[PDB]
Amino acid sequence: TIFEERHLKYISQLGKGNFGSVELCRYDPLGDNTGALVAVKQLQHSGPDQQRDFQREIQILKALHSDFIVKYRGVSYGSLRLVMEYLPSGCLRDFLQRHRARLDASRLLLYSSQICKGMEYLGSRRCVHRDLAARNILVESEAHVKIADFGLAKLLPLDKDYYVVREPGQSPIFWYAPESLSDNIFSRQSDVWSFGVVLYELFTYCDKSCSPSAEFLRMMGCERDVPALCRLLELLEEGQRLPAPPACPAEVHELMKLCWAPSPQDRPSFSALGPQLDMLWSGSRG
Numbered sequence: 411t412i413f414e415e416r417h418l419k420y421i422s423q424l425g426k427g428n429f430g431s432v433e434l435c436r437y438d439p440l441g442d443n444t445g446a447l448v449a450v451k452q453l454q455h456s457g458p459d460q461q462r463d464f465q466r467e468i469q470i471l472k473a474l475h476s477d478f479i480v481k482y483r484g485v486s487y488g489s490l491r492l493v494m495e496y497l498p499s500g501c502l503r504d505f506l507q508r509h510r511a512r513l514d515a516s517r518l519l520l521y522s523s524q525i526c527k528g529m530e531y532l533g534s535r536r537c538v539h540r541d542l543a544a545r546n547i548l549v550e551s552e553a554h555v556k557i558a559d560f561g562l563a564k565l566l567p568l569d570k571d572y573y574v575v576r577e578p579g580q581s582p583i584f585w586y587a588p589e590s591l592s593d594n595i596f597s598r599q600s601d602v603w604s605f606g607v608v609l610y611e612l613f614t615y616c617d618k619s620c621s622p623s624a625e626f627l628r629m630m631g632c633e634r635d636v637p638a639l640c641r642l643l644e645l646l647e648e649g650q651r652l653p654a655p656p657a658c659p660a661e662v663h664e665l666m667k668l669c670w671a672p673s674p675q676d677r678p679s680f681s682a683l684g685p686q687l688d689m690l691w692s693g694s695r696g
């Protein structure tokens with residue numbers, strides 16, 4: 411499923427960040443502005459090692475088939491461009507901030523359940539996302555979200571249930587499991603930890619003032635003579651966690667705290683979380 415680079419007409423820039431250079435394009439082979447809109451990712455000034463990692467990302471997405479994972483469309487020029495379905499409602503983070511006044515707990519629990527199903531499917535494929543965050547969730551419609559941004563995703567080794575990542579660059583440390591922060595260990599259970607942070611983001615409607623980073627930076631205290639990563643590990647080791655968001659049901663906060671168990675094996679699986687989020691979405695008494 412090769413897309414000709416001359417048929418991809420540039421419309422606008424969706425964004426530029428760690429997730430690459432993403433452009434909204436029209437795939438117009440007839441050349442009449444009739445074609446479908448697509449999201450096109452490229453790595454700008456990308457060396458042969460970065461391009462090899464990109465080819466790997468493309469192959470993960472190509473083999474993924476879920477209604478709760480953004481749909482792979484194709485590749486362009488084998489420099490290399492990844493072609494994805496375009497979701498015009500944007501990221502979940504911005505949608506929650508904008509429609510907060512009319513999104514209730516049941517609607518937040520519906521998104522949580524969909525993310526959890528997508529993550530259960532990802533785990534059955536032995537793939538670790540490594541960057542679950544509201545920013546990396548796309549809105550398909552009012553009642554449908556999809557997991558996006560597979561730039562950090564890894565396929566687990568055939569004989570191991572964890573992946574050790576030795577790569578340069580900055581990490582979103584305030585979304586990361588303690589074993590990821592301390593020893594660069596990633597797994598389906600470190601994805602469960604980040605899912606607990608996604609739950610916290612949903613129930614704060616992604617309010618920037620009480621974001622995971624703003625909360626943890628406040629918890630550290632007034633003293634800043636210790637590097638943040640060392641202070642964050644100390645906080646987590648002594649049992650400090652993000653607080654219960656205002657108006658967050660007590661049972662949703664109980665699921666967050668379980669996702670944030672210090673031991674990866676003590677964290678619930680996406681399989682076990684899903685039916686519990688569905689039950690909470692129903693509004694039924696437990």
Ligand SMILES: O=C1CCN(c2ncc(C(F)(F)F)c(C3=C(c4c[nH]c5ccccc45)C(=O)NC3=O)n2)CC1
Nearest residue numbers: 424425429432449451480494495496497501546558559
């Ligand atoms: O803010 C973010 C940044 C992380 N994120 C994301 N990262 C990468 C892609 C890519 F594969 F297209 F490159 C897409 C993606 C869009 C995007 C839709 N809106 C944006 C805005 C910015 C960047 C990418 C997209 C899409 O429609 N289909 C996709 O796969 N999304 C969710 C939005």
